[PDB]
Amino acid sequence: ASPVIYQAEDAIIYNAILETVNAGYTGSCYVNYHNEVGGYIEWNVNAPSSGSYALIFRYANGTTANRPMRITVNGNIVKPSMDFVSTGAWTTWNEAGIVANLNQGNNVIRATAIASDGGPNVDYLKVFSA
Residue 118's Cβ-count burial label (10 Å; 0-12, 13-18, 19+) is buried
Smallest separation, CB 75 to Ca ion (Å): 25
- 50 vs 64: CA distance, rounded Å: 38
How many residues bind to Ca ion according to rule CB under 5 A? Answer: 7
40 labelled binding-site residue: no
Binding-site member from 123, 125, 126, 127 for Ca ion (CB under 5 A): 123
Please identify, among the stretches 33-41, 66-74, 91-99, 122-130, the one whose residues bind Ca ion according to the rule CB under 5 A.
Answer: 122-130
Beta strands in the chain (DSSP E): 3-7, 12-14, 17-19, 30-32, 40-47, 51-60, 69-73, 76-82, 93-102, 105-113, 121-128
- 77 vs 91: CA distance, rounded Å: 30
Please identify, among the stretches 3-11, 64-72, 93-101, 102-110, the one whose residues bind Ca ion according to the rule CB under 5 A.
Answer: 3-11
- Is 3 an interacting residue with respect to Ca ion (CB under 5 A)? no
- Is 27 an interacting residue with respect to Ca ion (CB under 5 A)? yes
Query: First and final CA of the chain: distance in angstroms?
Result: 5
- Is 122 an interacting residue with respect to Ca ion (CB under 5 A)? no
Taking the least distance from each CB to Ca ion, the nearer of 27 and 80 is 27
Q: How many CA atoms lie within 13 A of 108 on its CB side?
A: 9
Interface residues with Ca ion (CB under 5 A)? 8, 25-27, 30, 123-124
**Binding site for Ca(2+): what residues are annotated?**
7, 26, 29, 32-33, 35, 123
